Amino acid sequence: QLTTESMPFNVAEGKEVLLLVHNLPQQLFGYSWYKGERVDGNRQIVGYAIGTQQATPGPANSGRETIYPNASLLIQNVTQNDTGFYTLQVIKSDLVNEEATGQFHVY
Amino acid sequence: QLTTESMPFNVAEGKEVLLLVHNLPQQLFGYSWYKGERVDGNRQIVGYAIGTQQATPGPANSGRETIYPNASLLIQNVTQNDTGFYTLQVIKSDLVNEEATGQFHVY
Amino acid sequence: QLTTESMPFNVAEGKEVLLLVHNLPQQLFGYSWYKGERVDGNRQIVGYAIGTQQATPGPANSGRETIYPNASLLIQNVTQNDTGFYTLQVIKSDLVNEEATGQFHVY
Amino acid sequence: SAPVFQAGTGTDSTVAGVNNEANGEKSSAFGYENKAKEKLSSAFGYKNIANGIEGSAFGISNLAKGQYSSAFGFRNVANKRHSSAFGSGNEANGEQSSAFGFKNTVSGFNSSAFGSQYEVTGNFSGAFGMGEFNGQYQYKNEGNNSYMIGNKNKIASGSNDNFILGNNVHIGGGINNSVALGNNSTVSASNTVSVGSSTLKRKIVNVGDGAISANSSDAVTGRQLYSGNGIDTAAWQNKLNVTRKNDYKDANDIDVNKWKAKL
Amino acid sequence: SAPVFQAGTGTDSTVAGVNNEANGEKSSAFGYENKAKEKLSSAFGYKNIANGIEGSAFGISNLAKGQYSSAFGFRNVANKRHSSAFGSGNEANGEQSSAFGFKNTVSGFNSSAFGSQYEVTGNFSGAFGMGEFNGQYQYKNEGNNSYMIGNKNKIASGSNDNFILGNNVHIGGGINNSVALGNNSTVSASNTVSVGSSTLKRKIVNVGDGAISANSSDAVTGRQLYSGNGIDTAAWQNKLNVTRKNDYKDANDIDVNKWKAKL
Amino acid sequence: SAPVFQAGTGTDSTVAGVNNEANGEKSSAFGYENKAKEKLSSAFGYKNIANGIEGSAFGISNLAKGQYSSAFGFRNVANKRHSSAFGSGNEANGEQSSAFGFKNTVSGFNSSAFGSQYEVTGNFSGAFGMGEFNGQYQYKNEGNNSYMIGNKNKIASGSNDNFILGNNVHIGGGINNSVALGNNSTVSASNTVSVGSSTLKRKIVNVGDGAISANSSDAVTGRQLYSGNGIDTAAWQNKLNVTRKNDYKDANDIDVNKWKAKL
């Protein structure tokens, strides 16, 4: 089962937050990170394409989010408005989709 | 059954002639008026399209024929060369066709 | 069976060589002459298209080979490097292919 | 009638469904009330007819009459050799022709139509885009070796070798070797490129500098007219009667007697 | 379960394969686990669903929901009337729309997409070429009566009547009636034709001679500026203060007293 | 042999017709002498072979070898992943490639061909129109990120980022970032736009007025050269030696002794 892990769960007001993915399926097509609980066009942060090895930011990008080629997200200089839920969508080689959810709270 | 009615059947040399349609099928695609008994490309007066709500004259138009959005034809300032037969073609939403025939004589 | 005939088999150092075809199938699409034993893109002399009635030389053309509209080849001013094997490809109206082989040696 | 799964009236033929009939050699009729009538023909779906040798009808109410012809979708017609109709309501009446999309008619040799409601009656021509249809086609491509891209465009008969990329462009008779660019553009002569009409005109921007020489067919930018570098001094000096400063400081080419009088 | 060849639950319906069900009148379900649910609908292949009247699904995992809709290939979706999806992974959500190729989405009225990874959300628009897709579409055509040919192009919403033939061209909001030509070109105004950008500029070559007259909207070549034929002599002679040679040989328009002083 | 309606040699497989064989898991072979050999594969029609996982062959003598590949029509070949062949005699040997029409070959990554007798061997390229074929292809598109629209056009290898809209245009090696417009046009340099050849030249008509300033890259019309408004007076006055009228009426900058001699 696809799983997402936050590290650390509780973070300071100026540190880095890293979200990792375990049990990622093989033979994929691309990734996409969203904000909240639902997959929405207007609430996308960053996406990655494996065919061209390309990374492209989305409408809800501020300049502090970075994607890595293992479905991993890095956020720097977090504030009190960055606390809550996040959603990950994985597209496979057969055009089928998978979803995962992570969470973290800032103090 | 699709029917066409002329009013009046006998008309003067300067009056108006009106052709009406009864039992028009629903869910249509367009209309087209011809001159004579056969559907011919070179003998079309006017046509109407429901998708864009458009009316466009044909090669056999003189400037005296008007179409209405109920498959009705109006002819003004008739002469002795405008007497005879007329044909109506109706295209449905399934791309099938229907034909009707009307007639009037001028004295 | 498609057959190719050379005339003459033994030719001089400055004469003409003519290759003819017997039992050519009907309802064809085009012809193509190659050098050697295999059909290769880089070793084509000339080709003919029946749809447009066109003849177009290939990469391995020197200026001495002529095609006729009966799958016949004429070579003029032969040298000692023009001796050996030749291949003919015939494309039919169903997009299927046929091959034939001819040979001649120069003294 | 109940469905039946057995052989047909031809040799090595097969019918599968309700009220099917296969009459050719090695023919297949699968679905509801299909008809295969020739050699190596296939009718799959609902009320499909295949009358040509090696013709295929797949879908709903399709007709394949030519040899090596294909009708795929809803109410398509293929009539000639190597003609293809794909989509909804397409007819192809030319050899090696292709109709793709919604209500496209092709009747030329090696012509292609993609989109909605175009007719191509020319040879070696092509249409990409949208037109209109209300019983008859109101925008056609009737030229040879001409191509159209856009909405509501027309090329007349006898006008050959034309290219249109735009909307509402109508080329008349007697025009050859022309290019039209933009929306609501007009062409009225041969061997011309038009970028507008007589009511609205366009500007060409981001153009590099040309060459100013005796035989130079390159466009000229505004800076070159502003500065004037590279022009023939003698031609402009004898076109506009100029008295040169070096010949003015030192009195040259003067009529002496007339200067005696006034002075 | 073993394959079964019999009638369905509708009138004059047929199921042929394993675990098929036909529920409409004159419907056909042939293959593995197909579903035909309406009148005159056909499902052929592997796990195909036809929910619309006269809708056809042919291939692997296709959906045909609209009336007179066609889905042909691998994982295609047709939703509206007279909508066609042909190829791999195409969806058509507009009336009389066409999606052809790999991963193309059309949601406009009478719009067409051919190629790889474009979305056309405008009306009477068209796309030919390649884009990108990583969960969401990153290049869309959102203008009306606009056409795009190439790779990685964008048109915003509210920008209508535009034509692009090139790569990496992005048109912003508020631009109408423009044409962009070339690779890496930019457009920043209405009623303009652009052939480059502010960093790289192109030259226009092989241009015929224009007309030099009072009202002539034709381009000017380098030879015409070099020679200067056909210009207004009086306008240039009073724009640049010239003392004409015929008025210099014969003393005319001189202030006599000032010539008395110096001489 | 008589037709047979039973199970195949795989798990949950089905054969329907004459001399059919299905060997994969959940496979379907319907028609005359069809062959399905992999998982979730479909062969419908006459002598069709499906050798790839989730590959579909529909029609007459089609081959589907790649994964998620589709062959629809008469004698089509699909070889790679997500490759589509639609029509008559098309082959697609590239990943995510599309061949539509009559005798089209694509062997590039994300490339598209529509029409008759073109070969596209480049990556991210496209062809729309007509070519020629007599055993070998005589017009190919061998450039990357290049597009061709018309009849009998060629792009060589190593020439990238090119766009052609016309007929009989041949681009040689070493040319990049060029645009060719018109019939029988020639291109011979990089970063250029050509509207003709060295034997026939075209005119650009209906052009708006540019800007005459120090840094203005806009085209100039005939009226601007006719009138001469907006030019630098000092640059033209020192380029062409002019004696100004105000300096001629009042004797200025004269060599007094030389005027003493002659007068």
Side-chain angles (χ1 to χ4, degrees), chain F residues 18-51:
Chain F
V18 179
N19 281 320
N20 286 331
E21 49 191 2
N23 292 320
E25 188 195 28
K26 307 167 180 324
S27 46
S28 299
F30 283 25
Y32 180 83
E33 210 166 1
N34 291 289
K35 263 175 271 292
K37 299 184 182 181
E38 263 308 302
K39 184 179 182 292
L40 312 188
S41 61
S42 283
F44 277 61
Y46 172 82
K47 284 218 208 275
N48 289 321
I49 306 190
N51 289 337

mmCIF file of all heavy atoms in Angstrom, chain F residues 18-51:
data_model
loop_
_atom_site.group_PDB
_atom_site.id
_atom_site.type_symbol
_atom_site.label_atom_id
_atom_site.label_comp_id
_atom_site.label_asym_id
_atom_site.label_seq_id
_atom_site.Cartn_x
_atom_site.Cartn_y
_atom_site.Cartn_z
ATOM 1 N N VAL F 18 -13.970 -19.587 -37.594
ATOM 2 C CA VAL F 18 -13.342 -20.723 -38.259
ATOM 3 C C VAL F 18 -11.837 -20.654 -38.027
ATOM 4 O O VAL F 18 -11.194 -19.655 -38.371
ATOM 5 C CB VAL F 18 -13.662 -20.745 -39.762
ATOM 6 C CG1 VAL F 18 -12.971 -21.915 -40.432
ATOM 7 C CG2 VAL F 18 -15.160 -20.808 -39.986
ATOM 8 N N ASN F 19 -11.279 -21.721 -37.454
ATOM 9 C CA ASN F 19 -9.834 -21.883 -37.269
ATOM 10 C C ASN F 19 -9.220 -20.715 -36.499
ATOM 11 O O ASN F 19 -8.209 -20.135 -36.896
ATOM 12 C CB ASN F 19 -9.130 -22.078 -38.612
ATOM 13 C CG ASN F 19 -9.260 -23.491 -39.137
ATOM 14 O OD1 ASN F 19 -9.182 -24.458 -38.380
ATOM 15 N ND2 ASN F 19 -9.454 -23.622 -40.445
ATOM 16 N N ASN F 20 -9.840 -20.377 -35.375
ATOM 17 C CA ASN F 20 -9.337 -19.354 -34.473
ATOM 18 C C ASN F 20 -8.610 -20.010 -33.307
ATOM 19 O O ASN F 20 -8.878 -21.162 -32.957
ATOM 20 C CB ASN F 20 -10.480 -18.483 -33.947
ATOM 21 C CG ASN F 20 -11.005 -17.521 -34.988
ATOM 22 O OD1 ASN F 20 -10.272 -17.086 -35.873
ATOM 23 N ND2 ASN F 20 -12.284 -17.182 -34.888
ATOM 24 N N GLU F 21 -7.682 -19.268 -32.704
ATOM 25 C CA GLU F 21 -6.968 -19.751 -31.527
ATOM 26 C C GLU F 21 -6.649 -18.581 -30.609
ATOM 27 O O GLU F 21 -6.040 -17.597 -31.039
ATOM 28 C CB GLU F 21 -5.692 -20.504 -31.918
ATOM 29 C CG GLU F 21 -4.796 -19.784 -32.902
ATOM 30 C CD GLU F 21 -3.702 -20.679 -33.445
ATOM 31 O OE1 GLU F 21 -3.674 -21.873 -33.077
ATOM 32 O OE2 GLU F 21 -2.868 -20.191 -34.237
ATOM 33 N N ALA F 22 -7.069 -18.690 -29.353
ATOM 34 C CA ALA F 22 -6.759 -17.716 -28.315
ATOM 35 C C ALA F 22 -5.926 -18.394 -27.237
ATOM 36 O O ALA F 22 -6.372 -19.371 -26.626
ATOM 37 C CB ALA F 22 -8.034 -17.128 -27.712
ATOM 38 N N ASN F 23 -4.722 -17.873 -27.001
ATOM 39 C CA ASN F 23 -3.771 -18.505 -26.101
ATOM 40 C C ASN F 23 -3.525 -17.737 -24.812
ATOM 41 O O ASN F 23 -2.935 -18.303 -23.887
ATOM 42 C CB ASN F 23 -2.426 -18.717 -26.810
ATOM 43 C CG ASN F 23 -2.509 -19.744 -27.916
ATOM 44 O OD1 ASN F 23 -3.168 -20.773 -27.776
ATOM 45 N ND2 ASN F 23 -1.836 -19.472 -29.028
ATOM 46 N N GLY F 24 -3.951 -16.478 -24.718
ATOM 47 C CA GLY F 24 -3.717 -15.676 -23.540
ATOM 48 C C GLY F 24 -4.852 -15.765 -22.533
ATOM 49 O O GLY F 24 -5.883 -16.394 -22.755
ATOM 50 N N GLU F 25 -4.636 -15.112 -21.396
ATOM 51 C CA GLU F 25 -5.638 -15.058 -20.339
ATOM 52 C C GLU F 25 -6.610 -13.921 -20.628
ATOM 53 O O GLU F 25 -6.194 -12.766 -20.769
ATOM 54 C CB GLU F 25 -4.968 -14.870 -18.981
ATOM 55 C CG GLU F 25 -5.917 -14.996 -17.805
ATOM 56 C CD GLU F 25 -5.326 -14.462 -16.518
ATOM 57 O OE1 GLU F 25 -4.472 -13.554 -16.585
ATOM 58 O OE2 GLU F 25 -5.716 -14.950 -15.437
ATOM 59 N N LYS F 26 -7.900 -14.250 -20.716
ATOM 60 C CA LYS F 26 -8.957 -13.294 -21.047
ATOM 61 C C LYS F 26 -8.703 -12.647 -22.411
ATOM 62 O O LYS F 26 -8.568 -11.430 -22.543
ATOM 63 C CB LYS F 26 -9.108 -12.237 -19.947
ATOM 64 C CG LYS F 26 -9.292 -12.805 -18.551
ATOM 65 C CD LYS F 26 -9.110 -11.731 -17.494
ATOM 66 C CE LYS F 26 -9.301 -12.288 -16.098
ATOM 67 N NZ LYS F 26 -10.356 -13.336 -16.062
ATOM 68 N N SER F 27 -8.647 -13.495 -23.434
ATOM 69 C CA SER F 27 -8.391 -13.081 -24.804
ATOM 70 C C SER F 27 -9.583 -13.433 -25.685
ATOM 71 O O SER F 27 -10.381 -14.315 -25.360
ATOM 72 C CB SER F 27 -7.119 -13.737 -25.352
ATOM 73 O OG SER F 27 -7.096 -15.122 -25.059
ATOM 74 N N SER F 28 -9.697 -12.731 -26.812
ATOM 75 C CA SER F 28 -10.839 -12.887 -27.705
ATOM 76 C C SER F 28 -10.380 -12.915 -29.154
ATOM 77 O O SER F 28 -9.658 -12.014 -29.601
ATOM 78 C CB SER F 28 -11.851 -11.756 -27.500
ATOM 79 O OG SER F 28 -12.360 -11.764 -26.179
ATOM 80 N N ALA F 29 -10.816 -13.941 -29.885
ATOM 81 C CA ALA F 29 -10.512 -14.082 -31.310
ATOM 82 C C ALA F 29 -11.816 -14.314 -32.069
ATOM 83 O O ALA F 29 -12.339 -15.432 -32.082
ATOM 84 C CB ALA F 29 -9.522 -15.214 -31.550
ATOM 85 N N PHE F 30 -12.341 -13.265 -32.706
ATOM 86 C CA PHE F 30 -13.614 -13.342 -33.416
ATOM 87 C C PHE F 30 -13.404 -13.056 -34.895
ATOM 88 O O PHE F 30 -12.810 -12.035 -35.261
ATOM 89 C CB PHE F 30 -14.649 -12.362 -32.847
ATOM 90 C CG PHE F 30 -15.284 -12.806 -31.553
ATOM 91 C CD1 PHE F 30 -14.644 -13.684 -30.701
ATOM 92 C CD2 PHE F 30 -16.543 -12.355 -31.207
ATOM 93 C CE1 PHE F 30 -15.236 -14.084 -29.522
ATOM 94 C CE2 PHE F 30 -17.141 -12.759 -30.031
ATOM 95 C CZ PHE F 30 -16.485 -13.623 -29.189
ATOM 96 N N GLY F 31 -13.903 -13.955 -35.744
ATOM 97 C CA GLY F 31 -13.814 -13.757 -37.177
ATOM 98 C C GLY F 31 -13.304 -14.964 -37.935
ATOM 99 O O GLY F 31 -13.711 -16.093 -37.652
ATOM 100 N N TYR F 32 -12.416 -14.746 -38.904
ATOM 101 C CA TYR F 32 -11.854 -15.835 -39.700
ATOM 102 C C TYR F 32 -10.352 -15.924 -39.456
ATOM 103 O O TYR F 32 -9.596 -15.038 -39.868
ATOM 104 C CB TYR F 32 -12.150 -15.654 -41.186
ATOM 105 C CG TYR F 32 -11.586 -16.770 -42.037
ATOM 106 C CD1 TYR F 32 -12.276 -17.961 -42.195
ATOM 107 C CD2 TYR F 32 -10.356 -16.639 -42.664
ATOM 108 C CE1 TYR F 32 -11.759 -18.986 -42.959
ATOM 109 C CE2 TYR F 32 -9.834 -17.660 -43.428
ATOM 110 C CZ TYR F 32 -10.540 -18.829 -43.571
ATOM 111 O OH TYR F 32 -10.025 -19.851 -44.333
ATOM 112 N N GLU F 33 -9.930 -16.997 -38.790
ATOM 113 C CA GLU F 33 -8.522 -17.369 -38.642
ATOM 114 C C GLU F 33 -7.705 -16.249 -37.994
ATOM 115 O O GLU F 33 -6.710 -15.770 -38.535
ATOM 116 C CB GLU F 33 -7.935 -17.780 -39.993
ATOM 117 C CG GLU F 33 -6.821 -18.801 -39.894
ATOM 118 C CD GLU F 33 -6.498 -19.441 -41.227
ATOM 119 O OE1 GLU F 33 -7.128 -19.065 -42.238
ATOM 120 O OE2 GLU F 33 -5.612 -20.319 -41.267
ATOM 121 N N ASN F 34 -8.142 -15.850 -36.805
ATOM 122 C CA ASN F 34 -7.484 -14.818 -36.020
ATOM 123 C C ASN F 34 -6.612 -15.451 -34.940
ATOM 124 O O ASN F 34 -6.749 -16.629 -34.609
ATOM 125 C CB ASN F 34 -8.511 -13.882 -35.383
ATOM 126 C CG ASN F 34 -9.220 -13.015 -36.400
ATOM 127 O OD1 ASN F 34 -8.629 -12.102 -36.973
ATOM 128 N ND2 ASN F 34 -10.493 -13.299 -36.633
ATOM 129 N N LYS F 35 -5.711 -14.642 -34.386
ATOM 130 C CA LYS F 35 -4.731 -15.112 -33.410
ATOM 131 C C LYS F 35 -4.543 -14.062 -32.325
ATOM 132 O O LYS F 35 -4.070 -12.956 -32.601
ATOM 133 C CB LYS F 35 -3.400 -15.431 -34.091
ATOM 134 C CG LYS F 35 -3.214 -16.900 -34.411
ATOM 135 C CD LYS F 35 -1.943 -17.140 -35.201
ATOM 136 C CE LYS F 35 -2.193 -17.026 -36.690
ATOM 137 N NZ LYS F 35 -3.042 -18.141 -37.193
ATOM 138 N N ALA F 36 -4.916 -14.406 -31.095
ATOM 139 C CA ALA F 36 -4.638 -13.599 -29.912
ATOM 140 C C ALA F 36 -3.702 -14.392 -29.012
ATOM 141 O O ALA F 36 -4.020 -15.523 -28.630
ATOM 142 C CB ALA F 36 -5.926 -13.235 -29.176
ATOM 143 N N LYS F 37 -2.558 -13.803 -28.670
ATOM 144 C CA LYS F 37 -1.475 -14.550 -28.048
ATOM 145 C C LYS F 37 -1.003 -13.999 -26.713
ATOM 146 O O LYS F 37 -0.053 -14.550 -26.143
ATOM 147 C CB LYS F 37 -0.276 -14.627 -29.004
ATOM 148 C CG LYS F 37 -0.574 -15.328 -30.313
ATOM 149 C CD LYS F 37 0.675 -15.460 -31.159
ATOM 150 C CE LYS F 37 0.369 -16.119 -32.490
ATOM 151 N NZ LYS F 37 1.590 -16.272 -33.325
ATOM 152 N N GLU F 38 -1.620 -12.946 -26.187
ATOM 153 C CA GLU F 38 -1.140 -12.334 -24.956
ATOM 154 C C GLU F 38 -2.327 -12.058 -24.040
ATOM 155 O O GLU F 38 -3.455 -12.489 -24.297
ATOM 156 C CB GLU F 38 -0.334 -11.065 -25.258
ATOM 157 C CG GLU F 38 1.168 -11.282 -25.298
ATOM 158 C CD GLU F 38 1.688 -11.989 -24.063
ATOM 159 O OE1 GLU F 38 1.484 -11.467 -22.946
ATOM 160 O OE2 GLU F 38 2.303 -13.065 -24.209
ATOM 161 N N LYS F 39 -2.057 -11.329 -22.963
ATOM 162 C CA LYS F 39 -3.044 -11.050 -21.928
ATOM 163 C C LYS F 39 -3.884 -9.839 -22.312
ATOM 164 O O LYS F 39 -3.342 -8.779 -22.636
ATOM 165 C CB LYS F 39 -2.343 -10.813 -20.591
ATOM 166 C CG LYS F 39 -3.272 -10.617 -19.410
ATOM 167 C CD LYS F 39 -2.482 -10.406 -18.130
ATOM 168 C CE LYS F 39 -3.403 -10.246 -16.932
ATOM 169 N NZ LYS F 39 -4.188 -8.982 -16.996
ATOM 170 N N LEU F 40 -5.208 -10.010 -22.277
ATOM 171 C CA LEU F 40 -6.168 -8.938 -22.558
ATOM 172 C C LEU F 40 -5.998 -8.387 -23.973
ATOM 173 O O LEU F 40 -5.935 -7.175 -24.189
ATOM 174 C CB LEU F 40 -6.061 -7.819 -21.519
ATOM 175 C CG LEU F 40 -6.047 -8.216 -20.042
ATOM 176 C CD1 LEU F 40 -6.140 -6.986 -19.162
ATOM 177 C CD2 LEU F 40 -7.168 -9.185 -19.725
ATOM 178 N N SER F 41 -5.938 -9.288 -24.948
ATOM 179 C CA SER F 41 -5.744 -8.924 -26.343
ATOM 180 C C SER F 41 -6.965 -9.319 -27.161
ATOM 181 O O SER F 41 -7.646 -10.301 -26.854
ATOM 182 C CB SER F 41 -4.487 -9.584 -26.917
ATOM 183 O OG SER F 41 -4.582 -10.996 -26.861
ATOM 184 N N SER F 42 -7.241 -8.543 -28.210
ATOM 185 C CA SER F 42 -8.445 -8.712 -29.014
ATOM 186 C C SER F 42 -8.101 -8.716 -30.496
ATOM 187 O O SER F 42 -7.402 -7.813 -30.981
ATOM 188 C CB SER F 42 -9.458 -7.604 -28.714
ATOM 189 O OG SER F 42 -10.114 -7.842 -27.483
ATOM 190 N N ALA F 43 -8.604 -9.724 -31.210
ATOM 191 C CA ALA F 43 -8.415 -9.836 -32.655
ATOM 192 C C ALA F 43 -9.775 -10.032 -33.312
ATOM 193 O O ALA F 43 -10.385 -11.100 -33.172
ATOM 194 C CB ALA F 43 -7.474 -10.988 -33.000
ATOM 195 N N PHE F 44 -10.241 -9.014 -34.041
ATOM 196 C CA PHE F 44 -11.569 -9.039 -34.651
ATOM 197 C C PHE F 44 -11.454 -8.799 -36.150
ATOM 198 O O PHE F 44 -10.910 -7.771 -36.579
ATOM 199 C CB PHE F 44 -12.488 -7.994 -34.014
ATOM 200 C CG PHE F 44 -13.140 -8.448 -32.736
ATOM 201 C CD1 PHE F 44 -12.376 -8.792 -31.636
ATOM 202 C CD2 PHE F 44 -14.517 -8.525 -32.634
ATOM 203 C CE1 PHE F 44 -12.972 -9.206 -30.463
ATOM 204 C CE2 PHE F 44 -15.116 -8.939 -31.462
ATOM 205 C CZ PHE F 44 -14.342 -9.279 -30.377
ATOM 206 N N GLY F 45 -11.966 -9.744 -36.938
ATOM 207 C CA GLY F 45 -12.034 -9.562 -38.377
ATOM 208 C C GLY F 45 -11.493 -10.696 -39.226
ATOM 209 O O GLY F 45 -11.973 -11.832 -39.140
ATOM 210 N N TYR F 46 -10.502 -10.395 -40.067
ATOM 211 C CA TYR F 46 -9.937 -11.381 -40.986
ATOM 212 C C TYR F 46 -8.422 -11.414 -40.831
ATOM 213 O O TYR F 46 -7.740 -10.445 -41.181
ATOM 214 C CB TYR F 46 -10.327 -11.072 -42.433
ATOM 215 C CG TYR F 46 -9.619 -11.933 -43.453
ATOM 216 C CD1 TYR F 46 -10.068 -13.212 -43.740
ATOM 217 C CD2 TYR F 46 -8.500 -11.467 -44.131
ATOM 218 C CE1 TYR F 46 -9.423 -14.003 -44.666
ATOM 219 C CE2 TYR F 46 -7.851 -12.254 -45.059
ATOM 220 C CZ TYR F 46 -8.316 -13.519 -45.322
ATOM 221 O OH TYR F 46 -7.673 -14.305 -46.247
ATOM 222 N N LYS F 47 -7.904 -12.530 -40.317
ATOM 223 C CA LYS F 47 -6.469 -12.797 -40.221
ATOM 224 C C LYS F 47 -5.727 -11.665 -39.509
ATOM 225 O O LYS F 47 -4.863 -10.996 -40.074
ATOM 226 C CB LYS F 47 -5.872 -13.056 -41.606
ATOM 227 C CG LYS F 47 -6.191 -14.426 -42.175
ATOM 228 C CD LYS F 47 -5.002 -14.992 -42.926
ATOM 229 C CE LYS F 47 -5.435 -15.952 -44.019
ATOM 230 N NZ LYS F 47 -5.654 -17.328 -43.498
ATOM 231 N N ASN F 48 -6.079 -11.467 -38.243
ATOM 232 C CA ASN F 48 -5.477 -10.437 -37.410
ATOM 233 C C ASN F 48 -4.632 -11.078 -36.320
ATOM 234 O O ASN F 48 -5.001 -12.120 -35.769
ATOM 235 C CB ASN F 48 -6.548 -9.545 -36.781
ATOM 236 C CG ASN F 48 -7.214 -8.635 -37.788
ATOM 237 O OD1 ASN F 48 -6.563 -8.099 -38.683
ATOM 238 N ND2 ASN F 48 -8.520 -8.453 -37.649
ATOM 239 N N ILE F 49 -3.497 -10.453 -36.013
ATOM 240 C CA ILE F 49 -2.562 -10.952 -35.013
ATOM 241 C C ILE F 49 -2.361 -9.878 -33.954
ATOM 242 O O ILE F 49 -2.090 -8.718 -34.282
ATOM 243 C CB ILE F 49 -1.217 -11.353 -35.645
ATOM 244 C CG1 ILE F 49 -1.440 -12.341 -36.790
ATOM 245 C CG2 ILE F 49 -0.294 -11.950 -34.602
ATOM 246 C CD1 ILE F 49 -0.174 -12.976 -37.309
ATOM 247 N N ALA F 50 -2.500 -10.266 -32.689
ATOM 248 C CA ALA F 50 -2.261 -9.386 -31.548
ATOM 249 C C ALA F 50 -1.247 -10.060 -30.632
ATOM 250 O O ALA F 50 -1.576 -11.032 -29.945
ATOM 251 C CB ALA F 50 -3.559 -9.083 -30.805
ATOM 252 N N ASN F 51 -0.019 -9.543 -30.619
ATOM 253 C CA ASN F 51 1.075 -10.141 -29.870
ATOM 254 C C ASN F 51 1.465 -9.350 -28.631
ATOM 255 O O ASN F 51 2.308 -9.817 -27.859
ATOM 256 C CB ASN F 51 2.307 -10.305 -30.767
ATOM 257 C CG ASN F 51 2.132 -11.385 -31.807
ATOM 258 O OD1 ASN F 51 1.320 -12.294 -31.644
ATOM 259 N ND2 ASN F 51 2.905 -11.299 -32.883
#
